[PDB]
């Protein structure tokens, strides 16, 4: 039994801390409006979604991204209070954060014990998946740029070790044209556009099949493709005949 007037939320049957439907609220003592966003209460930082519900998690304030923690995580903190959390990673569900000396979450590129990570500027959450950053293509897992062949919006790119091609940054997709790539014990072939080819291919008189999901040549034994079984050698070359 509450009402929302002109994007401002009020509850009747009210000011201060209110538990409603299990979810926690703080209606401003003066305006009776439900607090939204970063909110200071008794010198203690809290954070509410746009709907007024208090949150546990990592959210941006005027001093950067803060950790709004469950009860009794640090000192005797109240549920939802921002806490001191220094020089370490935080793992919340499948999200990863790195917290600095001033208990704020890292954003952008950061070097942690000699390893480089990228944390999304808008969430502080460890990057995952294809990303374009200052016109450079990266493919992230758990905040770490991956090396290998991964599928982006324009097909499979070669995300390479530093200085593979004219000083590319570590994990940056590079130009890599009309040639085989032998990488993870895996075999790939790259066309003129620097994308890995998939499917059946004839290259230098030999037949190959590059798996659609990974772009790796079928290699090292028996494979089923199109409902039948083929043998592919150690070099990815299809043997004669079909079983």
């Amino acid at each position, epitope marked *: 039994g509450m009402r929302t007037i002109d994007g401002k939320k009020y509850y009747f049957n009210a000011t201060g801390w209110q538990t409603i439907d299990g979810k926690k609220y703080y209606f401003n003592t003066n305006t009776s409006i439900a607090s939204t966003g970063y909110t200071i209460i008794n010198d203690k930082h809290f954070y509410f979604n746009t709907d007024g519900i208090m949150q546990i998690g990592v959210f941006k304030g005027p001093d950067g991204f803060e950790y709004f923690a469950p009860a009794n995580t640090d000192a005797n903190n109240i549920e939802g209070q921002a806490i001191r959390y220094q020089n370490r990673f935080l793992y919340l569900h499948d999200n990863i954060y790195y917290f600095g000396n001033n208990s704020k979450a890292a954003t952008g590129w950061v070097t942690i014990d000699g390893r480089r990570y990228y944390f999304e500027p808008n969430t502080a959450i460890g990057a995952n998946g294809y990303k374009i950053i200052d016109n450079k293509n990266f493919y992230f897992r758990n905040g770490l740029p991956q090396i290998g062949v991964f599928k982006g919006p324009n097909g499979f790119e070669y995300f390479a070790p530093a200085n593979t091609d004219a000083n590319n940054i570590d994990g940056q997709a590079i130009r890599y044209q009309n040639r085989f790539l032998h990488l993870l014990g895996n075999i790939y072939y790259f066309g003129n556009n620097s994308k890995a080819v998939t499917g059946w291919q004839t290259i230098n008189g030999n037949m190959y099949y590059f*798996m659609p999901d990974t772009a790796m040549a079928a290699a090292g*034994g028996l494979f*089923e493709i199109d*409902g039948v*079984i083929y043998f592919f050698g150690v070099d990815g070359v299809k043997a004669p005949g*079909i*079983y």
Partner: nanobody
Amino acid sequence: VKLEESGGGLVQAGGSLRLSCAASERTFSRYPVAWFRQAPGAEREFVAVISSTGTSTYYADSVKGRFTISRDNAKVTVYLQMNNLKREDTAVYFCAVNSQRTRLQDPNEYDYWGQGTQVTVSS
């Protein structure tokens, strides 16, 4: 995919058995299906594989000519006909699906397995 093997048991050398591997879902028919066998103490050794369609097969050398792998996708079932059985054929037999369709002889590449059925060849 859930798989259930049946048809094993005790048998005299030179005899025969037909093993069955039944699934519960039609999606079975999308994937190649293999038999592996495990003797006590030993590792799961490859026996035969059949393609999703049933038109393409491959057998280990030791069973070639004696065993025949087949399937009936209407009954969502794969069969292994085992003729002229030998003492060396004694083992638990498992059927397995390889949904990635890669490296069909390698048991590690198979993600769905039956519970197994015992085959024991006497004298």
